[PDB]
Write a protein that binds this ligand. Structure first.
Ligand SMILES: [Mn+2]
Ligand SMILES: [Zn+2]
Ligand SMILES: [Zn+2]
Ligand SMILES: [Zn+2]
Ligand SMILES: [Zn+2]
Lengths: 98, 1407, 96, 49, 49
RNA sequence: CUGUGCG
C-alpha cells in the first residue's frame, strides 16, 4: 500500500459506520432495512475488497448486499445458529398423476 | 429546365392549355440565393404584368432551382460538362466570361463579395467624378494640432459673444417653479369642459364602476343544472367546428335545435327550472345562449326552427344520422336531437320571461360616482377585479369564430340585439355579467355590458374598444394592486403624502388600463423626460414643446390630469416639498414608466404605416432630395443626378460661424476635418491604430449599384412604447451588404474603447463610471439625439472614412477602404420601397407627405413607389457605422471641452443616445455655456441634440437605465408590465420558462417578492384557464429571494415540488437518495454511463433503478412511485397550430449564429382545447378526455395537492399519462447539485423573528458553488451527446456542421457531470439545465430589499460524513510526516517530483 | 435470500426496527451491540444534525444507551467545553 | 471618502452639512428624521447626536 | 507484459530510473483507480506518440 | 386554422 497504512484503518471505518447508525437510530425509530443502511455515508463496507471483517453483528446482511439483495428485515440473530440445530420433522404426501 | 418542371407536371418556357385556362411555368437556375431571389422576383413581376392584359385567366408558376440537380442517369453529366465547358472557354467576352464562372462554384468560392473584392470593373459612368467633387473636395485630414486648438479657441470666443450672450443657446437652467407651472399648463387642462371624474369621461371606466358598485351592494341543485347546460353547450361547440354538415347555417340551426330541446327537457322534471337557475345562471331577457358565443331570441329561435322542418321535412333524422355515423363519442345527446321541440311549451316559456332586450348604445351631467378618492380599500380591488373580468371577456370576444347571421338586419343610434354574440363572466353567487357584440375577428368593436342579478337584466352600459389591447389586466387584479401598494409604501417617509398619492395612483392605473392609447404612452414618456430634467439642473429649451400630446378625447385628458396632479403633489411646495427626493424620483419615474402597461400593437396598422412613411419622407422633402423611382437599376437621369449632387452640396454647405443652421441635416466640413485630424494623430481618446483588421450577378459595379439591384430596402414600422420606430427590410444582396458594413464597423468599434452597443464589458464599465460620477457630484449629461436615423447619411460616413487612418496592428500601412467606400456609396444610392398600403391609401385621399404624394402623382411623373435620398440612413442598416461616427465625433467633442473649458470629460455612446461624465475643476450655472457650445458643435455635425437630453449633477440616464446618487432606480413598473405583457404562449412549459426568466430579471432589479408571487399566480391562472390544468411544474408561487438569488429554474421547480410535499418525509428521502448517488458519482468510484442506460427507459423504471442503488426495496419503491401527476406532454409535445428532445433544439439554435400578445393567448387557449394531447399512436385527443379518466381517490395521497398529485390506482383508466413526480424531483435535485452545489440536499430551516422598513435595498451576489468546470463549452455538450447518444448524434444532429473535427478529437474529454446530468435534461422536457449551463447568469448581481433577506429561508450545504472523512489537519500533518520520514532515508531534491509523487499529497484536493 | 420462493400465503410482515440501538422485532427488545465513539465522534455526530429538538432527543437517549456500553475514554477536557455549545444540562442530569 | 457634499435626502443642499455615517446630511433633514425615529432611512444606521 | 517489464528492468540495473517510472505509474494509477478525474484526457495525451 | 375554459 502506498498510503503506508494510513487511509482509514478499516476498523475505524466499521466503527464509524456503527456509531453513525446507532446515533441516527437514537433520534427516531427507523426500520433496519437496507434503506437505512445504503443511504448512510459511512456504509463503505461495499468497498474494501478484503471483506474478512464486517462491523459487529450484521455480517450476513453485508454478505447478501455483496449479492445485491433486496431484503428488508427478519430475525438476524445468527449468534444462536438458525441454520444449525433445526428440527427435522420431515414427511411426504400422495401424488397426482398428470 | 426539363428535369425541374417534370417534378411539377410540365411540358418540354412551359405552356399547358386546357379548355379556357392556361398554366404558364417559367424556370431558372441560380445557385446564389441573391441572384436566385432576384430572378424569382423579376420572373414573378413580368409574369404578373401579363394577366392584366390577358384578362381584358392564367396559372403562373415560377421554378427556381438552387442547384443543377437531375434525375436522368446519375450525377455524372451535369457538373462535369459545365466544368469542361468553362475550361474550353478558358482555353479559347469579358463580363460574360466572368459571369459564367462566378455563377457556379458552390455559393461562395470566388463569388461571395467580402470586404476584399473590388475586382469587378472599377469603372466610371460620367457621374462618379462629380460625386467625389461634391463629397471629397473639402477633406484634408492632415491638419496640425496647434491650428485646430487655436481655431477652437477663436470659435469659443465667437460663440460666447454671438450665440450665447445673445440668448440663442439651446439649453437653460431648470427653474423648478417654472417647470412645474409649465407642466400644469401643458398637462393639467384648465380650459377644457371635461368633468373632474374619470368615470364620467371614460365610458369603460363608467361601465367598470357600474358593474362593481352594482355587484358589491346587491349580493357581493342550485349549481347542478347550470353545469349540465354548460357541458352540453361545450359538446355542441365541439361539433360546431368539425364540418359534419354541408352549410354553416344548417349547422347553427341544428345546434340551436339541440339547445332548445335541452331547454324544453329541463323545463319539466323540475319545479322551477328556468325561473330559478336560468335567471340566476346563463339566460338573458327573452334570449338564450347558444353555440359560438351567440345569444338568440327564443321567439326568433323557434321561428327559425319552424323553418327547415316544415319547408324541409325529415331533416332531424338524417341530420342526426350524419352526426352519429361521424362522431360516436359525442352521442351523449340522447333526447335533444329529436323531433319538434314542443313548440307550445317553447312559446309559453318565452311569454314567461318577457324582459327588455339589450339596447347596444351606438351614440357616444350628474356625477354620482362616490368620489373614488374616498373609497374603502375593498371597492378599489373590486373595481380592479371587474376590469379583469371585462378584459377577459373582451379577449374571449376576440376569440369568436366568423359565423353568419341567421336573422335579417333592419348601427345608427341603437340596435335591439337579437343575433349578437356574448361573453359571460361570472361575478357573484347570483349575478353574472354579459358582454354583447355584433362583430367578429380582431378589429375594434362596440361592446355592451349588462348584468343579471336574479334574471333582471340591468344595463351597465356600452362602449367602443379594440379587444387585443386589454390583455394586461386580464388576470392581474392583484399584480397591479401590489405594484401600487409598493409604490405607495415607497413614500412611507411622509405619513399623509402616501395617503393622497395612493388612491390617485390607483385611479391613474385604472384609467391607463381602461384606455390603452399611444397618446397616453407618449404623454407618460414625456413625463419621464420632464422628471429627468426636473431632477437635474440644465435642460433643453424645447423640452416642454415635446411633452405636449394632443388628447383628441377626454379619456386622454383625464389620465393627463391625473399624472400631472400626481407629479405636482410630489414636487410642488416651497420648503417641505422635497423631503425624500430619492423616493420621490423613484416614484415619479415608475409612474412615468407605467406607459408600459399599455400594449404596443399599432391600434391601426394602416394609420401607423402612414405615420411611418410620413416620418420617413418628411426630412427628405424638407431637405430637398426626394428623387422618386430614379432607375431601379442604377442609371440616374440628368435631373436625378442633379438633385442628388445638390442634396450632397446642401449636406456639406454648413459653415462654422452661422447659428441659423443648427437644425437642418448636414455636417460642417471644417469641423469634420478637425475631427478626422485629431483622430488620426492619436489625439482623441480613441486611436486609429486598430487590431484584428475587419477585412474578412454582381459583375460590373459603380458608385450607384452593381447591376444586381440598387440596394433595395422596404419601409415598415417597429412597435415601440412611445412612437413606432422605423424599419427597413432589405433583399438578400443588400442585406449581405449591410452585414458587411456592420461587421467592418463592429470590428473597428471593438478596436475602439468608449463605444458600448454590442460590448457588454464596455457597457458595464460605462455603468460603473456613471455611478461613481453621480456619487462624486460630476456633471452627468444624458444626451439623446433626435432623428438620428432620418438625418444620418451614408455620404457622411464616406466623408469620415475618406481620411480615416485606421492603422493595422502589425503592418502599419493605412489599409485602404475602397470596398467599404464603394458599398457606402451604394448605400448612398439606396432605394426605399414605400408601402403599397400607404400608396393605395394616399391615392383614395392636410399632410406634408400627402402633399408630396399628390404633387408627384401625375404632375412630375407617375405614381410614387420608390424613394432615394442622400440623408436618412436606415435605422438598423448602418447601426455600427453610425456608432463609430458618433464615437469619433464625441471623442472629438470631449477633447474640445477639455481644451476650451479645462474640464475632464469621458463619454459613452450607443449610436442613439450617449452619456458624458464631466469632472469639473475647483449651481451648474457657469457650465451652461459649455453645454450650449457642445450642443452647437454637435449640431454643426449630424448629431442634433434632442430636447429630451438633460444635464445635471443629480441623476444620469443611459440605455433606459437611470442612476441616482448612492443607488439605482429599479424601474419596477417597466419590468412588471414586461412580465404581464409579451406572453408568447406556445407551450405552457415554454410560457412558464419565459415568465420565470422575466421574474428573475425583475427581482434582480429590486421589484419585490410579493409582486412576483402574484405574477406567478396570474401565469398559473392563465395556464389553467386554457384548459391545460395545473401541473406540479410551472410558475413558482410563494417563493423567496433565495429561489432567484443563487438559484436557477431547476431550484425553483425543486422548491415548488417541496412545497407540494408538506412535512417532507418523502421528498427528504428522495433528497437523501440523490445525495447518496452524488457522493457516489462525484467521489469518483464507478458511476458514469450505466446511469444513462438506466435512465433511457423512462420515469418509472429509471426511478426504480436509481432507488435500487440505495436500499429501496419493493416496499419503499412502491411507496415512492405512488405519487403521480398527469403529464400531457409524455409521448412528445402538444400539437398546436421524431419529436427529439428540446435539448437538441436549443443546441441547434445556439450553434447557428407582428401578432399581438392577446392574439397569441387566444391561439394558445384555442389550441389547448383541440386535439393536442398525443397518445403515442398518432391519434391526438382532448385534454378533457385525459382528465376525465381520473377517479375520486381521496386516500390521503391525492389530497395533499388536489388536481396536481394523483395516486397509482387513481390513474388506472388513463395510465399512459402517469409519470412519477418524485422521479422528476430526484432529477431536479441531481441537476441542482450539478449546477449550483451541494446545498440543495439539506432541509429548509427558517429565521425565527426577522424590521427593515421595506426599503433597505442592497446588492447581493449569487452564492453558487458551481462544480461543472465553469467553462461548459458547446463542443463539450456536443462531444458528450456523441459519446452517449451516437444514433441521436448522427440523425437529428450535426447535418449542418463543418467543425466535427474539434468535437471529435477529445476536446476536454469527459467533463464532470456531463453524462448523467445531460441525460436528466435530455429525458425531462421541463428541466433544461444544459440551456442554463451554456449561458451566463445575465444578472451577476441582485438588488433586493433587506426585508426579504431577513425572511429568506436558510439552506446551507452540510457534509454528509459528519466531519469524519480525514480532518484535513490530519491530511496535511500526514503528508508532512511522510515527506520528512522519506527524506530521512536518503538526500532528495525538494522539487515537485518529490511532492507530486507522494500519496498523501492530496493538497491539490480540498477545494 | 428472504424470498418465499415464488409463492406463499404469508408475505411482507414482521418488520425489524431500531430505537435505542436495540433490535425491536415488534416491541420486544432483543439485545444491544457494543459501539465505541470516544466522545470526539459523538460531538462530530452532534454537529451535523437537523434542528434543536433532534439534538435534544439524541443526547437524552445517549446515556441510557451508554448503560448498555462501557466507554469512559471520551475526553473529559476542553473537548467537553466544546460540546458545551449545546446547553443541554437537563439531559446530562436526567440519567443521574 | 464621503459623498459629494450633498444632503442625499432632499438632494438639494450644499451648506453646513453633517455626516450621518458615510454620506452628508443637512440640518432640517437630520432633525426631521431624528424627531420621528432613531434610524436614518437613507443609510439605515443610527443618526449622530 | 510482465515479462517485458522484467526484461526492461533487467536492462536497467540498479534501478533508480525504472523505479522512478514505476512510482510515477503508481501515482497515476492511484489517481485513476481511486476515481477522481482520469478517463479520456489520457487518450488525447497518448495519441501524440 | 378552428376555442367553451374567470366560481
Ligand atoms: Mn439617453
Ligand atoms: Zn362622475
Ligand atoms: Zn389517492
Ligand atoms: Zn436636506
Ligand atoms: Zn445616513
Amino acid at each position: 500500500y502506498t498510503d503506508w497504512e494510513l487511509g482509514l484503518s478499516p476498523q475505524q471505518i466499521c466503527t464509524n459506520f456503527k456509531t453513525q447508525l446507532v446515533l441516527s437510530s437514537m433520534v427516531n425509530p427507523l426500520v433496519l432495512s437496507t434503506s437505512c443502511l445504503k443511504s448512510f455515508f459511512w456504509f463503505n463496507e461495499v468497498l474494501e475488497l478484503e471483506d474478512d471483517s464486517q462491523i459487529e453483528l450484521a455480517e450476513l446482511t453485508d454478505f447478501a448486499l455483496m449479492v445485491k439483495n433486496q431484503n428488508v428485515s427478519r430475525a438476524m440473530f445468527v449468534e444462536d445458529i438458525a441454520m444449525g440445530y433445526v428440527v427435522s420433522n420431515f414427511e411426504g404426501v400422495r401424488i397426482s398423476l398428470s | 429546365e426539363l428535369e425541374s418542371c417534370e417534378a411539377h407536371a410540365c411540358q418540354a418556357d412551359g405552356f399547358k392549355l386546357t379548355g379556357k385556362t392556361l398554366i404558364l411555368l417559367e424556370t431558372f437556375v441560380r445557385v446564389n440565393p441573391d441572384e436566385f431571389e432576384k430572378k424569382w422576383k423579376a420572373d414573378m413581376s413580368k409574369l404578373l404584368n401579363l394577366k392584366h392584359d390577358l384578362q381584358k385567366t392564367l396559372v403562373p408558376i415560377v421554378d427556381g432551382r438552387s442547384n443543377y440537380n437531375n434525375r436522368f442517369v446519375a450525377d455524372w453529366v451535369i457538373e462535369r460538362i459545365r466544368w469542361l465547358l468553362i475550361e474550353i472557354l478558358k482555353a479559347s467576352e469579358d463580363q460574360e466570361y466572368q459571369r459564367l464562372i462566378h455563377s457556379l462554384s458552390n455559393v461562395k468560392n470566388q463569388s461571395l463579395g467580402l470586404e476584399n473584392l473590388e475586382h469587378l470593373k472599377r469603372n466610371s459612368l460620367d457621374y462618379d467624378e462629380r460625386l467625389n467633387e461634391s463629397l471629397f473636395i473639402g477633406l484634408k485630414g492632415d491638419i496640425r494640432e496647434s491650428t485646430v486648438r487655436e481655431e477652437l479657441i477663436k470659435l469659443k470666443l465667437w460663440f460666447k459673444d454671438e450665440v450665447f450672450s445673445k440668448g440663442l443657446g439651446k439649453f437653460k437652467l431648470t427653474d423648478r417653479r417654472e417647470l412645474l407651472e409649465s407642466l400644469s399648463s401643458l398637462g393639467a387642462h384648465l380650459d377644457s369642459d371635461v368633468s373632474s371624474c374619470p368615470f364620467c369621461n371614460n365610458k369603460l371606466m363608467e361601465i367598470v364602476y357600474n358593474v362593481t358598485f352594482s355587484c358589491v351592494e346587491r349580493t357581493d341543485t342550485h349549481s347542478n343544472i347550470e353545469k349540465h347546460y354548460l357541458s352540453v353547450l361545450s359538446l355542441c361547440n365541439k361539433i360546431k367546428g368539425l364540418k359534419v354538415f354541408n352549410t354553416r347555417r344548417n349547422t347553427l340551426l341544428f345546434l340551436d335545435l339541440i339547445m332548445v330541446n335541452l331547454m324544453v327537457d329541463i323545463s319539466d322534471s323540475c319545479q322551477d327550472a328556468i325561473e330559478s337557475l336560468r335567471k340566476s345562471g346563463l339566460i338573458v331577457g327573452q334570449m338564450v345562449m347558444l353555440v359560438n358565443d351567440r345569444v338568440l331570441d327564443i321567439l326568433e329561435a323557434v321561428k327559425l326552427i319552424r323553418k327547415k322542418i316544415g319547408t324541409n321535412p325529415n331533416w332531424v333524422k338524417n341530420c342526426s344520422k350524419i352526426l352519429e355515423r361521424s362522431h360516436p363519442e359525442i352521442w351523449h345527446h340522447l333526447s335533444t336531437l329529436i323531433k319538434q321541440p314542443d313548440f307550445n311549451s317553447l312559446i309559453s316559456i318565452a311569454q314567461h320571461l318577457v324582459s327588455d332586450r339589450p339596447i347596444m348604445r351606438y351614440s357616444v351631467k350628474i356625477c354620482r360616482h362616490k368620489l373614488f378618492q374616498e373609497m374603502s380599500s375593498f371597492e378599489q380591488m373590486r373595481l380592479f377585479k371587474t376590469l379583469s373580468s371585462i378584459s377577459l371577456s373582451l379577449i374571449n370576444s376576440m376569440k369568436t369564430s366568423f359565423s353568419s347571421r341567421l336573422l335579417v338586419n333592419e348601427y345608427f343610434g341603437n340596435v335591439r340585439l337579437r343575433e349578437c354574440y356574448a361573453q359571460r363572466f361570472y361575478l357573484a353567487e347570483s349575478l353574472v355579467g354579459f358582454l354583447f357584440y355584433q362583430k367578429t375577428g380582431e378589429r375594434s368593436r362596440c361592446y355592451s355590458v349588462y348584468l343579471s342579478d336574479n334574471g333582471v337584466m340591468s344595463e351597465q352600459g356600452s362602449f367602443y374598444c379594440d379587444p387585443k389591447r386589454f390583455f394586461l389586466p386580464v388576470f392581474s387584479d392583484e399584480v397591479l394592486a401590489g405594484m401600487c401598494e409598493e409604490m405607495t409604501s415607497w413614500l412611507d417617509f411622509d405619513t399623509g403624502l402616501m395617503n393622497d398619492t395612493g388612491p390617485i395612483l390607483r385611479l391613474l392605473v385604472l384609467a391607463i388600463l381602461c384606455s390603452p392609447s399611444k397618446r397616453n404612452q407618449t404623454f407618460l414618456q414625456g413625463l419621464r423626460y420632464f422628471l429627468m430634467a426636473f431632477a437635474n439642473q440644465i435642460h433643453h429649451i424645447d423640452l416642454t414643446s415635446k411633452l405636449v400630446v394632443e388628447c383628441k378625447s377626454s379619456s386622454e385628458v383625464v389620465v393627463q390630469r391625473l399624472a400631472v396632479g400626481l407629479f405636482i403633489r410630489l414636487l410642488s411646495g416651497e420648503s417641505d416639498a422635497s423631503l425624500f427626493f430619492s423616493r420621490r424620483f423613484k416614484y415619479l419615474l415608475n409612474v412615468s414608466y407605467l406607459c408600459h402597461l399599455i400594449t404596443k400593437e399599432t391600434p391601426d396598422r394602416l394609420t401607423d404605416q402612414i405615420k411611418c412613411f410620413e416620418k420617413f419622407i418628411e426630412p427628405k422633402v424638407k431637405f430637398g432630395c426626394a428623387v422618386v423611382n430614379p432607375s431601379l437599376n442604377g442609371k440616374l437621369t440628368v435631373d436625378q443626378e442633379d438633385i442628388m449632387i445638390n442634396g450632397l452640396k446642401k449636406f456639406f454647405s454648413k459653415s462654422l460661424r452661422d447659428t441659423e443652421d443648427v437644425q437642418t441635416p448636414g455636417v460642417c466640413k471644417e469641423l469634420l476635418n478637425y475631427c478626422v485630424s485629431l483622430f488620426n494623430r492619436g489625439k482623441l481618446k480613441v486611436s486609429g491604430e486598430l487590431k484584428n483588421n475587419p477585412f474578412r450577378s454582381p459583375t460590373e459595379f459603380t458608385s450607384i449599384s452593381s447591376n444586381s439591384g440598387n440596394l433595395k430596402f422596404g419601409l415598415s414600422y417597429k412597435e415601440q412604447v412611445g412612437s413606432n420606430r422605423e424599419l427597413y427590410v432589405g433583399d438578400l444582396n443588400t442585406k449581405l451588404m449591410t452585414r458587411l458594413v456592420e461587421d467592418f464597423s463592429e470590428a473597428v468599434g471593438n478596436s475602439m474603447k468608449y463605444t458600448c452597443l454590442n460590448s457588454e464589458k464596455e457597457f458595464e464599465r460605462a455603468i460603473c463610471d456613471m455611478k461613481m460620477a453621480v456619487n462624486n457630484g460630476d456633471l452627468s449629461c444624458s444626451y439623446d439625439h433626435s432623428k438620428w436615423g432620418p438625418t444620418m447619411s451614408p455620404a457622411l460616413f464616406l466623408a469620415l472614412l475618406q481620411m480615416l487612418e485606421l492603422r493595422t496592428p502589425v503592418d502599419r500601412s493605412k489599409i485602404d477602404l475602397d470596398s467599404v467606400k464603394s458599398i457606402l456609396k451604394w448605400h448612398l444610392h439606396k432605394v426605399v420601397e414605400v408601402p403599397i398600403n400607404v400608396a393605395e391609401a394616399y391615392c383614395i385621399g392636410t399632410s406634408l407627405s400627402e402633399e408630396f404624394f399628390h404633387q408627384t402623382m401625375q404632375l412630375n411623373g407617375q405614381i410614387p413607389s420608390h424613394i432615394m435620398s442622400v440623408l436618412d440612413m436606415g435605422q438598423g442598416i448602418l447601426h455600427n457605422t453610425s456608432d463609430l461616427y458618433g464615437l469619433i465625433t464625441e471623442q472629438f467633442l470631449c477633447y474640445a471641452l477639455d481644451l476650451l473649458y479645462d474640464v475632464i470629460p469621458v463619454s459613452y455612446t450607443s449610436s442613439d443616445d450617449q452619456i458624458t461624465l464631466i469632472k469639473t475643476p475647483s449651481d451648474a450655472a457657469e457650465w451652461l455655456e459649455m453645454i450650449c457650445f457642445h450642443e452647437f458643435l454637435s449640431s454643426k455635425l449630424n448629431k442634433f441634440v434632442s430636447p429630451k437630453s438633460v444635464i445635471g449633477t443629480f441623476v444620469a440616464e443611459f440605455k433606459s437605465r437611470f442612476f441616482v446618487m448612492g443607488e439605482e432606480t429599479p424601474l419596477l413598473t417597466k419590468f412588471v408590465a414586461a412580465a404581464l405583457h409579451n406572453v408568447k404562449c406556445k407551450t405552457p412549459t415554454q410560457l412558464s420558462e419565459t415568465i420565470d426568466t422575466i421574474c428573475d430579471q425583475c427581482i434582480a432589479n429590486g421589484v419585490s417578492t410579493k409582486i412576483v408571487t402574484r405574477i406567478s399566480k396570474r401565469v398559473n391562472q392563465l395556464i389553467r384557464y386554457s384548459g391545460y390544468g395545473e401541473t406540479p411544474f410551472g410558475a413558482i408561487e410563494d417563493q423567496d429571494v433565495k429561489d432567484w438569488v443563487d438559484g436557477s429554474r431547476g431550484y425553483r421547480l425543486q422548491r415548488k415540488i417541496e412545497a407540494i410535499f408538506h412535512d417532507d418525509k418523502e421528498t427528504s428521502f428522495i433528497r437523501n437518495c440523490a445525495r447518496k448517488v452524488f457522493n457516489d458519482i462525484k467521489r469518483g468510484r464507478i458511476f458514469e454511463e450505466n446511469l444513462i442506460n438506466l435512465i433511457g427507459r423512462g420515469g418509472d423504471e429509471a426511478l426504480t433503478g436509481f432507488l435500487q442503488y440505495a436500499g429501496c426495496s419493493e416496499q419503499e419503491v412502491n411507496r415512492v412511485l405512488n405519487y403521480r401527476w398527469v403529464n400531457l406532454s409524455s409521448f412528445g409535445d402538444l400539437r398546436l397550430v421524431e419529436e427529439v428532445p428540446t435539448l437538441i433544439k436549443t443546441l441547434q439554435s445556439k450553434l447557428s449564429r407582428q401578432s399581438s400578445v392577446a392574439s397569441g393567448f387566444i391561439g394558445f387557449c384555442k389550441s389547448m382545447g383541440s386535439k393536442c394531447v398525443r397518445d403515442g399512436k398518432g391519434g391526438f385527443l382532448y385534454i378533457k378526455e385525459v382528465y376525465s379518466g381520473v377517479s375520486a381517490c381521496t386516500c390521503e395521497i391525492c389530497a395533499l395537492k388536489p388536481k396536481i398529485i394523483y395516486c397509482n390506482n387513481s390513474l388506472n383508466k388513463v395510465s399512459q399519462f402517469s409519470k412519477p413526480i418524485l422521479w422528476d424531483y430526484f432529477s431536479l435535485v441531481l441537476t441542482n447539485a450539478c449546477e449550483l452545489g451541494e446545498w440543495v440536499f439539506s432541509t429548509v430551516k427558517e429565521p425565527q423573528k426577522p424590521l427593515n422598513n421595506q426599503n433597505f435595498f442592497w446588492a447581493v451576489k449569487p452564492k453558487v458553488v458551481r462544480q461543472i468546470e465553469d467553462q461548459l463549452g458547446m463542443n463539450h455538450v456536443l462531444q458528450s451527446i456523441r459519446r452517449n447518444y451516437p444514433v441521436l448524434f448522427d440523425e437529428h444532429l450535426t447535418p449542418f456542421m463543418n467543425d466535427l473535427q474539434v468535437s471529435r478529437t477529445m476536446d476536454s474529454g469527459r467533463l464532470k457531470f456531463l453524462d448523467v446530468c445531460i441525460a436528466l435534461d435530455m429525458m425531462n422536457e421541463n428541466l433544461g439545465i444544459i440551456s442554463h449551463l451554456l449561458k451566463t447568469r445575465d444578472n451577476s448581481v441582485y438588488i433586493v430589499k433587506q426585508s426579504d433577506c431577513a425572511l429568506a429561508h436558510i439552506r446551507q450545504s452540510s457534509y454528509t460524513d459528519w466531519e469524519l472523512g480525514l480532518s484535513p489537519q490530519q491530511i496535511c500533518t500526514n503528508f508532512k510526516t511522510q515527506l520528512v520520514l522519506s527524506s530521512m532515508v536518503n538526500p532528495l531534491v525538494l522539487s515537485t517530483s518529490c511532492l507530486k509523487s507522494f500519496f498523501w499529497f492530496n493538497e491539490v484536493l480540498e477545494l | 435470500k428472504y424470498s418465499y420462493r415464488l409463492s406463499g400465503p404469508e408475505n411482507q410482515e414482521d418488520p425489524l426496527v431500531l430505537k435505542d440501538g436495540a433490535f425491536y422485532v415488534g416491541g420486544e427488545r432483543l439485545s444491544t451491540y457494543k459501539v465505541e465513539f470516544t466522545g470526539d465522534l459523538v460531538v462530530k455526530a452532534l454537529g451535523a444534525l437537523e434542528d434543536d429538538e433532534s439534538v435534544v432527543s439524541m443526547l437524552h437517549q445517549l446515556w441510557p444507551y451508554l448503560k448498555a456500553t462501557s466507554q469512559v475514554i471520551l475526553f473529559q477536557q476542553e473537548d467537553f467545553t466544546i460540546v458545551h455549545d449545546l446547553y443541554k444540562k437537563q439531559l446530562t442530569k436526567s440519567i443521574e | 471618502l464621503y459623498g459629494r457634499y450633498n444632503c442625499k435626502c432632499c438632494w438639494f443642499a450644499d451648506t453646513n452639512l453633517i455626516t450621518c455615517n458615510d454620506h452628508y446630511l443637512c440640518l432640517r433633514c437630520h432633525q426631521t428624521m431624528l424627531r420621528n425615529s432613531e434610524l436614518c432611512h437613507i443609510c439605515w444606521k443610527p443618526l449622530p447626536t
